[PDB]
Amino acid sequence: MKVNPSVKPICDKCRVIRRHGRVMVICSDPRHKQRQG
Amino acid sequence: LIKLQIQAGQANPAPPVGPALGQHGVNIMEFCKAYNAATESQRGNVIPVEITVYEDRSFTFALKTPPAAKLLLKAAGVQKGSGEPHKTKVAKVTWDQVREIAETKKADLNANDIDAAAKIIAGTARSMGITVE
Amino acid sequence: MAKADKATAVADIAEQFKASTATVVTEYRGLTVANLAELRRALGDSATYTVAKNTLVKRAASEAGIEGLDELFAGPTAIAFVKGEAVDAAKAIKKFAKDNKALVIKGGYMDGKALSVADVEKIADL
Amino acid sequence: MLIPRKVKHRKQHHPEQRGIASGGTSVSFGDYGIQALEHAYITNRQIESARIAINRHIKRGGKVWINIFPDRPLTKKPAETRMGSGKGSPEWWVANVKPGRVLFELSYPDEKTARDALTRAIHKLPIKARIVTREE
């Protein structure tokens, strides 16, 4: 879970959502998974 | 159902024989030697070949005509390819020989007529930097 | 799928129905590009087999003389015209339909009069 | 590196950061430009970084204009010295940049790559900025 204030949809399948007041990037590739914080 | 470009009177370079099709369990000898026989009866070019495998390793061998660029390499005088297509234009090629090639690529390709075959092959020439004048 | 291009498609539909003798729509489900290549390399001499848009035919169908076929827009519109003989067409569609065992024929229509499955088999025979 | 070959007066006051642009509020020589929004002093090294950012993002061919030149110096004075006793020497050179002013102009065909390049060059600078087309 790369924690960074900059997250992006790296690949074509990274979807950007918002849980509980935190931005997240969910993807089938766990290298890509990340969030603000 | 796997396809390759194999040299005419030769056999057993590892990458063009082993990894793509020599792993799947169709044996080296019978295919390669019947194909050497047939391909030296052709003795024409590096003939491409495709293999249809059925449910019991039954392999059927289909031969083709050699590539368009190689046909140009042998016919049109383009002995080496131009690293800058459309900028160094060292080929002036004749619609005559391109039309014999068009007859060949009609008996091979989706060609509509000899004209459309000539246009197709000239288009590959356009892409690889071969100016059919 | 721009509008005047859909008008062009309408023109194609009418200009082939009225410029051909036989006309039957069929179906394709279980058929691919290479099979179409076999077909249109073999019987492309005089046959006319293509595919078109149902929702486009919904507006194209009142420009030609097909005023009796305003109910058969359920199923993909795979058009079969021929310009010459009338028994070659449906029998040839049967040839290829058994060559693949995927091509269905919807119905029968030749010079206005509606014809069913067994009628189309009789059309093969004659 | 960008510097002048000689200035008459090599110790100048600090430029002003008051007012909006009068010129350079219009793309001139390319197609895709950069426009500032704030007041800031932009130096030599920043502009070098930015032009390199652009040339490593188009990489082949497509031209880049720099409508700015650092022709106004600033004076650091050496370290751990009590205030007073003169005015330090020029060490780095700025250009003032008032809002509305245009810095860079690209000429590359595809807008995708061009807009991306200008963005990479924006993130090498201290100012909020935006991207411009020559159109109205």
Partner: protein, 192 residues
């Protein structure tokens, strides 16, 4: 050249000053000026949305058939007064026009270009000075660049015109320069 001169309701101004003008811009109008050989400088307020539709449609130089005080009038847009940041339209000068007049004009070119691979274009200029008729100003001087090679300096006295239109910028100009295209190693030696 079958132009439809756009129509616009304009009303003369009560107050002429900075406060009034800002209040007008705020409300959603744009002040404007009208003059020429009318020799009676009128001060108007147009409506900005309508004005922008007119411009976006028919280019910047675009004749107008105004409606002043119930009476109608004919005008041309000579000059605009734009803001840099917001890119509003702060003020607009308007030259009265009778039909059949020769007034000088400055329009924009359009590089319709697809070149050889080893080619790049450079637009040294956008704006060319012209005299034409009133109702017959163009919108886009289309210049085509296709099939051409490296250096081909498109001069200004090479563009195709209407019939009855004259070039008045000097024919020395480089409207375009077709450069020999750069190297990735030439891009290191430009501005360092």
């Amino acid at each position: 050249t079958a132009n439809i001169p756009n129509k616009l309701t304009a009303n003369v101004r009560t107050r002429t000053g900075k406060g009034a003008s800002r209040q007008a811009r705020r409300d959603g109008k744009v002040p404007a000026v009208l003059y020429g050989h009318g020799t009676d400088p009128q001060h108007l307020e147009l409506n900005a949305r309508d004005f922008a539709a007119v411009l976006r449609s028919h280019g910047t130089n675009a004749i107008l058939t105004l409606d002043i005080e119930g009476t109608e009038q004919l005008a041309l847009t000579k000059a605009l007064d734009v803001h840099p940041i917001r890119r509003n339209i702060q003020h607009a000068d308007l030259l009265v026009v009778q039909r059949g007049e020769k007034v000088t004009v400055e329009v924009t070119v359009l590089v319709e270009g697809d070149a050889t691979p080893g080619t790049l274009v450079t637009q040294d200029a956008n704006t060319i000075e012209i005299e034409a008729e009133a109702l017959s100003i163009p919108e886009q001087l289309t210049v085509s660049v296709e099939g051409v090679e490296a250096g081909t300096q498109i001069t200004a006295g090479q563009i195709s015109l209407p019939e009855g239109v004259n070039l008045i910028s000097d024919p020395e100009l480089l409207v375009v320069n077709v450069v020999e295209a750069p190297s990735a190693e030439a891009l290191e030696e430009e501005g360092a």
